[PDB]
From a paper:
The interaction of NP and vRNA has two distinct forms, either in FluPol:NP-0:RNA unit, or in NP+1:NP+2:RNA unit representing the vRNA in complex with NPs in the regular positions. Unlike NP-0 which binds the fork of the double-stranded part of the vRNA, each NP in the regular position accommodates ten nucleotides in a linear sequence and the RNA bound in RNA-binding grooves locates on the inner side of the NP ring. The D72-K90 loop in NP+2 does not fold into an ɑ-helix; it undergoes a conformational change to adopt a more open loop conformation positioned above the linear RNA. This structural shift enables broader surface coverage and stabilization of the vRNA, thereby protecting it from degradation. In our structures, the D72-K90 loop of NP-0 folds into an ɑ-helix when bound to the RNA fork, but in NP+2 the D72-K90 loop adopts a more open loop upon binding to the linear RNA. The minimal distances of NP-0:NP+1 and NP+1:NP+2 range from 10–15 Å, suggesting the inter-NP orientations may be flexible, possibly necessary for forming native RNPs.
Influenza virus ribonucleoprotein complexes (RNPs), composed of the polymerase complex (FluPol), nucleoprotein (NP), and RNA, are essential for replication and transcription. In the life cycle of the influenza virus, the viral genome RNA (vRNA) or the positive-sense complementary RNA (cRNA) segments are encapsidated by a virus-encoded nucleoprotein (NP), with their 5′ and 3′ termini clamped by the polymerase complex (FluPol; composed of PA, PB1, and PB2), thus forming the ribonucleoprotein complexes (RNPs). We report atomic-resolution cryo-EM structures of mini-vRNPs in two states: FluPol located inside (State-In) or at the outer rim (State-Out) of the NP–RNA ring. These structures reveal detailed FluPol–NP–RNA coupling and suggest a conformational shift in RNPs during the viral life cycle.
Author numbering: 21 to 391, 405 to 486
The structure:
RNA sequence: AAAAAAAAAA
């Protein structure tokens, strides 16, 4: 029921805004800096730690320059006498749940935290790429594709599971495979249920992302295997090479910083009355008139970091830059061209040379966020052009084989052409901001001079 | 109803 959904999302974002207002008011940040991105990431880490597990004191090799469970603080940067300064005394965590249950006066907002994580997810994904798994596990050159989705560091992401993308899901199989390559020998006993069941369900869902029943049954046949090994790994690798053209149903969730909902509940926003539309115009009209600023480091382009936060809010990193560009009204360039580093501020970075800058998060046109259209008609027909050469040498890849079975005939038939599906299809539904009812769409005209990625 | 377990980020 979409009605209760928009009701509940209005409620949760209203609760977020209220908790926003209060959480600020304690430490008393002035509202210009109270609607600012650094306090945005502070409250974000607070809601990151808000609902934890049992009490744990266990510590592992390589301490983290320290740790304390009594209370928790965050990077604090305040413009004092016109000059910013970072400071810290820590703040209790129980108190946090006490204030959060007051904000969600009687029923807490779990999906609210999921949506905050959604904010975090496009933030981190668009930010950059780390490769510590690369220094740990062996990995195929899938990165070479230059196109890969990524998950956040949040366990038990049942909701995340829906939005989730495919490539990193196979990677997650590989992560369990790493736990199993460093398998503690002393692990014989009841243990195995959670593992077998988890493998079952994750394999299920990774299969369920796409459509064609062939790879569905292939993924089931990898499932029924009792002892996952490198043969399963290479089978998943083919399946990934295919997923390149037979893309997965990777949905995109749009979320903004909480310093926007805060002044939006301060903007007399009766969210529930209109509801909210995470897939809808609502983030855009909220951002169209919002006011968010960010500590631009030295040698950084306000516009580049502006587009970075724009993508963090639109969940648009794994989308065609041409479309984004046509939607914002100014060229959306590859992250590499962004004269900017991460929005966060490493605790070592000096504040002496730090400066703030206004975020430009507006968009010329608006557009909806899908993952079905048979063939998007281009005025001069588009093809989703068939570049299948790296897949030629991929089907070669040392001439060993594809998935070895009837699948091999299925792949030596998929070789040529079937026109049965699409790939990386994020529906535009582009409209003028002056056309809220989305009465007339705008056939986009993209500049081919823009790196597709 | 009844559902898994470790470490900071350019």
């Amino acid at each position: 029921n979409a009605t209760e959904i928009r009701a509940s999302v209005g409620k949760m974002i209203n609760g977020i805004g209220r908790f926003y207002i209060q959480m600020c008011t304690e430490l008393k940040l002035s509202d210009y800096e109270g609607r600012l991105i650094q306090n945005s990431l502070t409250i974000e880490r607070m809601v990151l730690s808000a609902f934890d597990e049992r009490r744990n004191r266990y510590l592992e090799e390589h301490p983290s320059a320290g740790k304390d469970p009594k209370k928790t603080g965050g990077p604090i940067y305040k413009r004092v006498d016109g000059k910013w300064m970072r400071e810290l005394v820590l703040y209790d965590k129980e108190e946090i749940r006490r204030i959060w249950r007051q904000a969600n006066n009687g029923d807490d907002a779990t999906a609210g935290l999921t949506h905050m994580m959604i904010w975090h997810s496009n933030l981190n994904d668009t930010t950059y790429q780390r490769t510590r798994a690369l220094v740990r596990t062996g990995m195929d050159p899938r990165m070479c594709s230059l196109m890969q989705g990524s998950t956040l560091p949040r366990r038990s992401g049942a909701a995340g599971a829906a939005v989730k993308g495919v490539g990193t899901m196979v990677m997650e199989l590989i992560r369990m495979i790493k736990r199993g390559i460093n398998d503690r020998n002393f692990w014989r006993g009841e243990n195995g249920r959670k593992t077998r069941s988890a493998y079952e369900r994750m394999c299920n869902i990774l299969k369920g992302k796409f459509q064609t029943a062939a790879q569905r049954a292939m993924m089931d046949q990898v499932r029924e295997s009792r002892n996952p090994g490198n043969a399963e790994i290479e089978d998943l690798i083919f399946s990934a090479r295919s997923a390149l053209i037979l893309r997965g149903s990777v949905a995109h969730k749009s979320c903004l910083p909480a310093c926007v909902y805060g002044p939006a509940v301060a903007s007399g926003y009766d969210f529930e009355k209109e509801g909210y539309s995470l897939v809808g115009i609502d983030p855009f009209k909220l951002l169209q008139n919002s006011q968010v600023y960010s500590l631009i480091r030295p040698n950084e382009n306000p516009a580049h970091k502006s587009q970075l936060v724009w993508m963090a809010c639109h969940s648009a990193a794994f989308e065609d830059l041409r479309l984004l560009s046509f939607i914002r009204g100014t060229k959306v360039s590859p992250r590499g061209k962004l004269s900017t580093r991460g929005v966060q501020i490493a605790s070592n970075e000096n504040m002496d040379t730090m400066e703030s800058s206004t975020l430009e998060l507006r968009s010329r046109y608006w557009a909806i966020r899908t993952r079905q259209i048979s063939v998007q008609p281009a005025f001069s027909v588009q093809r989703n052009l068939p570049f299948d050469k790296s897949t030629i040498m991929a089907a070669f890849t040392g001439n060993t084989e594809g998935r070895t079975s009837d699948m091999r005939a299925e792949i030596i038939r998929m070789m040529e052409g079937a026109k049965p599906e699409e790939v990386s299809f994020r529906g535009r539904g582009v409209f003028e901001l002056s056309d809220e009812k989305a009465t007339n769409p705008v056939v986009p005209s993209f500049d081919m001079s823009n790196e597709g990625s």
